[PDB]
Structure formats: structure tokens, C-alpha cells
Amino acid sequence: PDGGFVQVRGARQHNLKDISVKVPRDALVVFTGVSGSGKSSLAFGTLYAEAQRRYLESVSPYARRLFNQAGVPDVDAIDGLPPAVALQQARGTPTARSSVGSVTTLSNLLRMLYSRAGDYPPGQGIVYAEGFSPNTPEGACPECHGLGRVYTVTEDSMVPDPSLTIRERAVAAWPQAWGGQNQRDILVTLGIDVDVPWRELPEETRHWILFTDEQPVVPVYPGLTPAETQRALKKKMEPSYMGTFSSARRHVLHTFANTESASMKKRVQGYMISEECPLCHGKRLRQEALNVTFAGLDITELSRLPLARVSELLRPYAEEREPGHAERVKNRPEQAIALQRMAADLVKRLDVLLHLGLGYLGLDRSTPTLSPGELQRLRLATQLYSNLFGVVYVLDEPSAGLHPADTEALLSALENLKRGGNSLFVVEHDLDVIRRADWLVDVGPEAGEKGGEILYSGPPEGLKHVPESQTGQYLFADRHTEPHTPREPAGWLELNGVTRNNLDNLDVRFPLGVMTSVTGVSGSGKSTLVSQALVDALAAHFGQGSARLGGDLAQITRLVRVDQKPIGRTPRSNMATYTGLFDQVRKLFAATPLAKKRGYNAGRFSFNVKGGRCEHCQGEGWVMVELLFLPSVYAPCPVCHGTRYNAETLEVEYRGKNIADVLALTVDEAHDFFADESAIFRALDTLREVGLGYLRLGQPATELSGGEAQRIKLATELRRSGRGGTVYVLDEPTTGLHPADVERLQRQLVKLVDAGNTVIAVEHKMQVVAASDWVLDIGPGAGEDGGRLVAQGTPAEVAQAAGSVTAPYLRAALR
Template sequence: MEETETVGTIRIRGARTHNLQNLSLDLPLGKLVGVTGISGSGKTSLALDTLFVEGQRRYLETLNPQIRRQLRRQSWADVDEIQGLPPTICLDSRTLSVGPRATLATLTEIHDLLRVVYFRDGVLHCPSCQSIVQQSTHDEILDDLVALPERTKLQLLAKVDDDNGIAPQDRLRQIAQSGFVRARINGKLVDTSDVLVLPEDAPRPVIEAVVDRVTIKEGIRSRLAESLDVALRLGHGCCLVTIDGAPDRHYATIRFCGVCHRAFADPQLRTFSHFSAAGACPACLGLGVRPVEESPKPKRRPKSTSRNHSQRAVAQVVPSEKCDECQGSRLGEVARHTFWEKRTLPDWLKLNVDEALQAVRQIETAWQQEALPGGKTTHQGLLRQNLIPEIIRRLDGLQRLGLGYLTLDRSAQTLSGGELTRSRLATLIASQRKGYCFVLDEPSSGLHRADLYRVKNALNSLRDVGNTVVVVEHEVDLLQEADWLVELGPGAGHLGGKLVTAGTPETTAAAPESVIGPWLQERRQFIQATDSPDDRQHDRSCINQPLPESIVLGACEAGFITIPPLRVRNVHVPALKLGMGQVVCLTGVSGSGKTTWLMEGILPALQQALNDRNQRSGSKALASGDRGLMATIPDELIEVVTIGQSPVGRGWKSFPMTVAGLWDLVRKIYAATKDAKLRGFTPARFSPWHPEARCPVCLGQGEVTLEADFLPDWKTTCETCAGDRFNPATLAIRFRGKSLGDVLRMEFSEAAEFFSNFERLARPLHLFCELGLGYLKLGQPMRTVSTGEAQRIRLASYLARPDFQGQRCFALDEPTTGLHPADVQALLKVFDRLVAAGHLLLVVEHHLDVIRAADQILDLGPGAGPQGGQLVAWGSQQDLRQNPASLTGQALRDSIP
């Protein structure tokens, strides 16, 4: 079938997925290919929804016929043909869903490797007395007994299982019936034929059957072996031997603590996994945290009528505390007490990548120095030759990608999009795959410019072993490094989806029709003019300047916020006084603590101040002692709005119009039509969640989940309603000839025209277009929207709301994620409007254009993780440029002003 395939290229012909307009192009195999274009131009439609989806379809076609039949019904990439496509793997932080139990170690499979190490080589210590738990074989016990001095009289006993609800008296009778004449009850020997008299409410007695009485002498071994067999069977793997005048000896063929007489089940691989019921801490079910019983919740009656995004977002940070049973390690008792090389599994997982790598390397070096005796068992060979080198490779990959500061037990849900993508990237490199096509969505996102070279190196090394690497990217420095660039456009939505340029970075920079060209050109000239800034080593140790007691940022005549000195984990920032009506940018290398400080420090403090004020206005006040360290806020501030990277508002159900709060207006328009009135349809009837209105198959989601265990997150358009979300009766109502399904498929720019007679709806729709979101479809599922787009939708929805009053503090976490340099300008326009209305914007960002546009900058560092968490520099852009300690200042100096 594929004999016409051109060697060395991936041939794409007639791609029409989403807004792609019958796109045909060739991509070089085995090269680093950058895909660029403004937001909505069709980059992800090409890279993810066409290349990757087609690659996945081909893989699934190789599976069994039954799965194939199920898959045939699904909608795949809309493309005439793709030739020469290798097996495809996608790294997309947008669709990479991580559960509450996922950690950095599980994502990178380091946990799985360590699990095998502990399963094979771990030594269990008794959780109660810390002594090593012994386990013997039948023959070892026998050897031990036969070696006793000649003529020793011993009794072999087995503890009778007493946990099966049988009364002690009956149990004794059973023992007698099994042929045992004597037993020991609570340490006293009795005849089993005796009637057992126990006082009322006595604790259940310990019953041990005397299996045999033996005198050690020549030739006793075979008899003893038989009796031992019986005793071990009766005692479920444990037995004891009594000798007059000596303490009891306990033996077990199962794991058994000889001090506490406690038996332990044999470990399994799953004993060391918190994903399994067998391995997870029973108190927190492997989550590591438990919900806090909150002391009386402040009753909050917000003045504003708007919904409370902020409180939800802040509440997510507060409500749980470390599980005290497992100290947050997520693992059960046995896993917490099994040692390997002086550490338990939780001990390893508590280390950060740098520390863990150092520790494993030390162990490896120690092994190399110790002479390898010939009799090493195979499992130790496996450990030394496979597992440990593999663990080192993966840790090393994480370190190279600048993630050395992350602890292995770090919850994956608290990782930023960029950290998540880079940890997957490290895992892929470590797995040493060759001949694949990797599709990556913005691997640079969330990365400080000082660390960009790490991603460059990683992508190059993936390519150099013989893979094709397709990167959707906006970072000019990375695009510059690509072997081949594909630019889509020229516009967004239905105005995009065409090939603008394809070629090397040089030819793209020179192409007059290229949108990214001027940026490439600028960067090239700059690189030629200076030495490469990436190789320059920055001295991160020169940070010893004393911090002032408090810092004032911006004009504070009108309203201002004060924040007390805060310490969140290792992040420490002095007191701040922030004027309203400005953009404050938080910068610093990845892992320096920016997000922690903003999301877990400032925002909860502001929220607390808001709650306190609202409570006081309701006559109740907090104890005055608490207020000493509280933030203060101006009266005009009515809400703290968090717009983070977390998928808040990105649930299955929502779509841009519901997030923007504009769908209600559309419903009213439809309810006012003649047909709707005739049928008695109210505005409520036009909600896709209304039981009588929605499509009965997808329940108003427009999508259904493919039920196959190997594809947990596979969503596909609902066949019944074709993505319209509504049932035919609802779709029959038309306004100006369009059904609600048609409306959901409109782009914002079209909708602004279509509803132009409805001022209340048209005005916000126009606003969305002005802010560069005109290409989005009204009913696009929020999960298919990039995090950057989702943040802009939420920001725009605040401006678009008719009842938008009062001042707010907006906290944004890397809002430029997924933005073309040209789109960043559109975002800055949103900022301008918000600031002009007196709002305060706190923005965590690496993008230099945003940093330049900020009124004030707080630069955290100097390094990542334990080396971070300090305020390095602050003030205006000029202040940072002049500060030799600031990496951000250096990045600003290295860029064109």
C-alpha cells in the first residue's frame, strides 16, 4: 500500500481537521520541526489532532479485530492521506490528565523501578519494635532443632488460629478431634479432653496445640520433619518450640517478628504502590493528605453578585493536611518499614531529584568498589545491571531538564504545565526510543529564559538518536534552533488553516509573508551581535544583600494592599505595600517559588482579609491577636480572582459561552422566538443540561467517552447529535434560520455579527474578538482550549460582564502559555483595560514582553528548590536591568529593549 512513500518525509495531503483548509505539506523525517502561527491558526489541529491522532489510529488498527470494529465508528483525523508517519507519541500538557495519586516519581516511572528494588531486595523491619523481621525455610528450622544438644527434650507447638469466631471451648474440642492430646492455654499445659472453664468476660485465651514431644537423638530428623510440617500447617507458617528451663523459640516460614510475635504477609510488588489497596495507607487511601475538619467556616456574603471563583480556588489550597498515619508518604505500614540501602521507599521519595541522583550514584560507586563475588544471585544482577542504571538515567534526565529541585513525591497535580511536559520529556529520553515521531506542545512553557537551553538540548538529543520531533512552539529562541519551520495562518479560526511558510529558520525569517519572520530576524541579528547568552554561566551566589523590612511597590495614594512578611515552605518574602491599578509581575527561574508564594502565600492572606472584613460587617470579628499579621485591603477591593493553570472551569460540561456567562443571553433570545413561545419553552429549556432539552446519548456534552481500557481519556464527537448537544425538539427552534447547534459551532467573530441586534450580547462578543479570541468556537469543549486561552476567556469574561463593578485583584499563572508573540500584544491590551479600571494584576510570567509591560517586578531566586525562595530583586524594569544578581535582569539586558 505504501510503496509510493517518499523516503525521508512525512507526506500530508488534504488535511481538513478543524479549521485546516485542505492543507498539504511535507515534513522532513528525523528532524526537529517547529510548528508556529498565531493562536487559532491551526497549529494544534495539524500537530496533535492530525499527525498524532492518525498515528494513534494506525497503532490501534494493529490491535484485535473487536477493538478495531469499535474504533471504526469513531471520528478520526480528517485527512486524505499521510505517508511515512512513524509511530507517534504525544506530550501535551493540555490533555495529560493526572489523578490525585500521581506523583513525579509515578509519572516518570521511577516509583515503579524503586518498587521492584524494594520487592526484590528490601528488608522488612517490624513496625512495632524495629527489629529485622525473619523468615526461614522448613529445612533451616529443622537444622536449627537437630543441632540442639543430644537428649534435649522439646515440645513442638502451633498456635491455633483464633480469629474465626469459634468459641474457645469448641476450638479445644476440635483440636482433640484432630488427634492432639495436649494443648497449652495461656501458657498452661492441659489435656484437650478437659472441659475448658473460663470466667465470664475473660479475654480470649491463647490456645496452642502440642503437636509433638521429641527428644533430640540420632535419627530423629525425619520424625521431626514430619511433625514440623504439621505444626507449620496448623500455625499458618508459624510454630514454637518449648524446652524446659529455656525461653520459647519462635520459628516461621512466613515473615515473622520474633520479638512481637507478629506475622507479616509476603510482600508483593503492589505492596509498594499507593495506587493499590494493598499498598496504600489505609487512612488516606494513598492520597497522603486528609481533609481538615474546618473550624466554623466564615459565612461569606459577597457584595458583588458575581460568582465566587476566588474562594473556590483558594479553598483548594487550604482544605487538607498531611495524613498523620503515613506522614504524607501515601504508603502502608509494610512499605514504610522496608529498608534498602539504609532507606525506606518513602525516604527515597522525600528526596529531590538532585539528592536522589547523588544517593543512587553513591550506592553504585560503593558496589563497584566492592569485589563482586561469583555467587551473586540473579536478582542482584538484575538490580545492578538494569534497575539502578535505569533509575539513574531517569533522574539524570530530570536534572538535565532543570527539574532537579522537585521532590520525587511531589504531587503531579501541583506541577505546572511546563514541569509536567518536561518530566514526560525526560522519561521519553530515558526510555531511549528510536524511530518515533514525537509531538510536543510548548515544552518551553513556564521555563525561565536562563533555562531554555535545557529544552533545546533535550529536543536535539531526541532527534539525534533518530526520531522526528514536531514541536508546537512560540518561543523564538527555540524556533530558531529547528531544522524546519512550518507556519500556519494567516489569520485565526476560519481565516487560518493555510500554510504560510515552510522552510528553514533562515528562509522563514526572510519570507515577507511570515508573521513570525520579524521576530526571528530580530533574534538572529541579536545573536550575531553578541556572544550566545545561553552558554554564559551566571553567578547565582552573589545574593547576600540584606532585605529591607518592607517594600513599597507603585503609587499608594489611592488604594493599596499591605501584605505581612510571609514564609511558605522555603519561600520567604518581606512585607509588601502594593498600590492598586498596576501590573505586578513575579519572575524567577522555574522552581524558585513564584507560584507557591503567590498562590499559597499572598492570595490566602488577601482572601482572609476579605473574609475578615465581610465577617466584621456582619458584626462578628476575629480575635484581635490574629489581625497583627494579616493583610490589609482597601475598601474598593471586593474580590480576589485566581486564574491559574489548574483546570478550574475546564470541566467536561463547560464551554466558552458558559464560562463567559453569556449563554443565558442566548437562551433568552431563543425563548423569545415565536416557535419557542408556541411550545412553551422557557429560557431554562435551552440549557444543554436540561433533561428535556439535551441529547439523550451524550447528556448535553456533545462528546462521548470511548469505552476501552487502553484509552482512558478518549473523547469523541457524539454520533447522535453530531456535537450539537441538544435533542431534535430543541434544535427545531431556529433564530434567523440557525439552531442552537449552529450557534455552538460559530466562532466568536461570526457570532458578534449574527447577534449584532442584541447590544447586551454583541458588545461582550466584540470584546472577545478585540482580545484576540475571535477564532474560538462558542461551544468548543473547554478541555480542548489551551491553558493560555482558558485564562484569557476568564479574564475577558470579567470585562464583558454587564454588572462588572468594584476593584479586583487578579492572580494569573503564566497567561502567555500558548500565545504567539503577536497574541501576547492582545493579552497586554486586556491588562491595560483592567489596570485602567483600577484593578491589581499579580502575574507569574517568564515572557519578556509581559515583564517589560509590568509596572513592578518581583524577582525570586536565586536558584530552584532549596536554592530558591528569596527575593533577589524588585522594582521597575530599569531597577532589574541594573541588578547584577537578577537572572531576569540579565534576560532583559540580553534582549532588545
């Protein structure tokens, strides 16, 4: 072997400059540099992606070489690369629905614990591990079928307005557009009156239409009048098609049970009535599996509890000290010999999770309600007992949402993963992790076209000799922005009686016209206080658990919340259209000599309206390849190749650029081009100020990270902030930002507080907390151990506070 190195040659994915790099296998390798520099294009876009393509084409020959539909990484050669697992899902994909207990494997193991070692009634038999699950017919309650809720449909729920005629869509529960008129045309063949108000039809007919199970198949004649339909039938003319009846109930319940669309399920649900299952009053299973207990609890009630509580309930059984042990060993059949080996097996797994500070989560907790750093940490933990050997793990900021007090627990789980025979590729901004890495790859001087090169590949200590590196400057040369003097409050906002999750009746104060950081351990309650409780207390006070508002209210006009979520879920969405600037752009195209010749208006230049867009992709530029059965991805449209418009629309040029020429423009280049178009140039200016000059006007939203989307939403709200009055609530606003980037972000947050506005930011890094004007330290620990206001004041005041876990770290930050 030529070292234990992976060797990469000719990598030019996105902005990579046809680079060569080598990286050790069996080591913690960290990929670093500013955002937009090309760190992900390398670790994920190139390394992970080539490693996975190769494996799957070997396990599924030709039956997976569909790959070039989706795309290949742009790279000459990679040698020495094992198979790869990404511990994060792809950029623009929906997270699937799970529980914490499913992703950790734990829920299965405790079905076998209830099946073999649990406390049955006086004499009930034995219930199998398959029958402690709501998803199996051996486990699911027969009333609700494991749903926990019972669903009905009525005439009132399905026909909200009975003055309507059947042709007037009186039965609203039927599908929109064509599917609704089909059923209506089926009824005219059957000789029912479609042009008479609903309530005037016999009860017998109204019942049938709404409730029958019957599905007759009848000739249908579109566009005929009732009378001329009956003459068609009588004279035996060719039916256009044969239609199949479906009652209103049939359609509603089949649509509910079976569709994959999320908005359709929500429409259908508007014509339904919802009630709790009475055979399992909340729980979801047979009442015989529910009789089998443990520590006084059936599976359901144990599952509500935090992982930490389940752990300390389980271990007396593992260490052989239950309420007595000599009580049932002289009588035991197998039970005690199986209960011992399982309670220890479960608690060994649980220690891994608990040591990663994840013991505040409940095993019934839904995966989409979890932060990106929470689920990547629960996936890390699961790997640590998975027994996988000889793979590469590809991680994307596993310290996101982590308190500095907890990084040694993260660092220690990564070394254990390494020591199991694996290699770790980690894109990280945390200087504490970068410092502990075996090897590091520093990418690009800057972002985009001015980045994409390798500044350094070697152990961290040698970065001290490369001066073009901004990682090396923070790490070794002491880059500060010099201290920040706290600004004085203008008023005080009171949030009293905050009941929610781990907060009992907690009373807290937020100062106004000032910037506050809300800090604390993971699972403390910051997100529960700020994002959940605060936000939907003052959304209720305006025109868009418990809580109560108070304080100097007459100072607050608007609430603006800035989330981490994408700007859109599909490639329709982009900066151009989210900022609102595309509207004037289309105006400028509609005013050109050639557009004027043809009868084009600005509408021709929309990709959201039929006419001038490519209709093959409906103007999205990109097409879904449901060829990938593991989360589907996007390929460029085979007809427009990503331009989004037909050929005739692209013949029109405003100042030597077609409309796709402008959407392909970087924020920086469009800043040049639109200098003298006032409203466009100003939108682009806030996007530039906030660090996104490398992005393209039309770049689809599915290609964007959480921090790129957060900053777009912020910029949209940056110039609207004339004077004060708006409270901005922000979750970790420096997500995916380099220490050098946050300096540029913080200046813009200063600007909007100068305007008279109040920013409240849930915050995890002391760099940002050190330049606040006020600080709220939440809860001692996580979960039951947290939830208290534990310190409040200026950063300098709080850096000396007692019974604070962030204090020492804030203090190290302050200078």
C-alpha cells in the same frame, strides 16, 4: 526512498484548507504561527492521530476498528509516517493519578535497592521488591491496607438528625434518590417502623440497620402503605421485585472503596470519620519493610526528598566511596556487587532529570499538582532513557513555564532524543526554540477561517523571504511595540511571614493600581508565593502554610484569580453559558410568533433543563466513547449530531436562525448578528478584544486549550471591572499565545489597570515582563537553592540587578 520526508496531502481537519505539506523525519520540526491558525489541528489532529490509528488497527485487527465511532482525521493521504507518541495528554481529558517516582520509573528501582542492598535489623531475613509498595498485599499495612488512614462510621456521623423518620431519610448515609427508598421499602417488608422518629426505635434495631453484615433478600412492594404491605405478604401477591438489604455502614464503605465518580466519593466521605493509621503512623506499609533503612532512612523518608538530594546521597555508593569500602567486601555475599551496579544505574537516570532542571521535585509529588510544562518535561526525561527507537515524539510547548536561562537544557534534551533514532514534531511559540530547529512549518495568515494554510515549510532561515508570516517578522524583522513608561503605585500590599514549601519567613511587597510581573527560575517559588500564599491570604480577608497581611488594605475590595483550568470538565460548558449571555438569547427565542403559539418559555431553549433539549445526550451534543480504554474521548451524539436539541425546538427561528444556528456562530459572526442587543453584544465584545473571535458560542469546553479557557475567564471579568478596587492575580497569562497575540492581550491588561485595579501576574517571558510597571525576581535557583526575594523594582531597574539570573535576559528584551 524519496528523501527522508513525511508527505501529507489533502489535510482538512478543522480549519485546515485541504493542504499539502512535507516534513523531514529524524529532525527537530517546529510548527508555528498565531493561535487558532491550525498548528495543533496539523501536528496532533492529523499527524499524531493518523499515525496512532494505523498502528493500533494493525496490532488489534477488527478489535480496534471501532475507530470510526470516535472519529478519523480528515486527510486524503500520508506517506512515510512512523508510529507516534504524544508527550502530552489529549485536550479534554482528566490527568490520572501518579507520583513523580512512578512516571520516571525511579520508585521501582529503589524498591529493588532496598530489597537487595539496604540495611536490615540485626537479623530480619529478606523483604522482596513487591513488598516495598503500598499497592501489593505483600507490601501494604494490614490496618489501613496501604491507605495510611483508618476509616470508621458512627450513628452520629450517619444519622446527623435523629428526630427524623426513616421515610424522612433519617439515615442520610444511604444513597440519594431511588437507592435510599429501596432500603426503606426493604425495612417495611421486614416489619420495621419507617414512620416513627429514629431515637424511638429500639437500640437493637438501630444498631442492626446501621452496622449489620447481613444482607437478606426480600419481596418488595413500592407505593404500598405499611399496613397494605403486610396484607400483600399475608395474601401472597406477586412482589414487584426482590430487594437486597445493605446496612448504612456497608453502603458507605463499599461506595468509598469502589466508585469512580469524584463527587460521590466526596459525599460518602461526609458520613465518615478519619484518623491516622496507628500501625504505620503516616507511612503506609508493613512495619517490617519499614525497618529496612538506607543512609538512615526507610523508603518513605527518602521519597519525600528532592531528586537532587536523592542523587547526591546515591553517588558515593556508585563511585565506590561510601563510609569505607574495604569494610564489607571481604565479607559480602553478593550485596556490594549488586549495590554498585544499581546506585550507578539510578544516578545515571537521575542526571537526565537534574539536567532538565527538575531536581527540586520530590518523588512522592502528585502528578495533578504539576504544571503542564513540568510533567511534559518529566516525560521527556523518561524517554531519554527508555530505549525507544524509530518513533515520532509530538510535543506541545515544552518551554511553557521555562525560564530563558534554561532553554539550552531543553534544546539539548531534544537533540539527544533526536540522536537516539527518533523524530520530533514540536508546536512552539518560543523564538529561541524556533531559531534552533532543523525545519519549520508556519501555518495560516491569521486565526480560524482566515488561517489554516501553509505559509512555509523549510529550514528557519528561508522564512526571511515570506512577508505574510508574523513568525518571520518577530524572528527577522524586529516587531516591537515601542517602550512602556512605568506607572506610579497608588499604595502597597504587604505579605509578611510567608512559610510554605521552600519559603521560610519571607516578607514581600506588592504595589497597587499597577501591574507587577513575578519572575524567577522554575521551582523558585513564584507560584508558591503568588498563586498559593497570596491568594489564600486575601481570600481569608474577604468573603470567599502561613502568611500575614498588611499595608494599605482599605484600597482592596475584591480578589479575582484567573487560573489555567478549563471552564468546565464536560461538553455541557461553553462560552455562551459561562459569559452569561445565553440567558437573554433564550429570552429572544421565547418571544417569537411560533414559540408563542406553542406554550414555550425560555426554558425550552436551555440544554441544561429537560424538555427542549436532546435527551439522548442530555443536551451536551456529544457522547463519551468508553471504547477507547486509553483515555476516553468524545464523539457527536448519534441522535442530534451535536445540535443539542430535539427537532421540534429547532423549527423555531429568531431572525432566520434556529437556536443551534446561533450556538454554531463564531464570536466574530455573533458580533455582527447581535449588534443591537446591548448586553449580549458587550459580552461578545470582550471576547473579541481578547483574541477569541474564531471560537463558536456553543463550542464545547473539552475542545479548548488552557490559554483559550484563561482568556474566556478574563473577558468575563473585563467589563465587570468598573472603577478600581479589585486585585487580579494571573498565572502566565500568555499561555499558548504567539508573540503577535500577546501585544493584543497586553492592551487589555493596560485597560483594567487604567480602571484602578491591580494585576499581579506570575510570568516567564521577558516580552511581557518588559512592559510591566514593577517586577519581583524570586529565589536564586530552584527548591532549596531558591525562595528568596532576589530583586525588585521597575523592569529597567531590575535589568541591572546583581545576583539575578533573569536580569541579563530582561536587559536583552529592553530597548
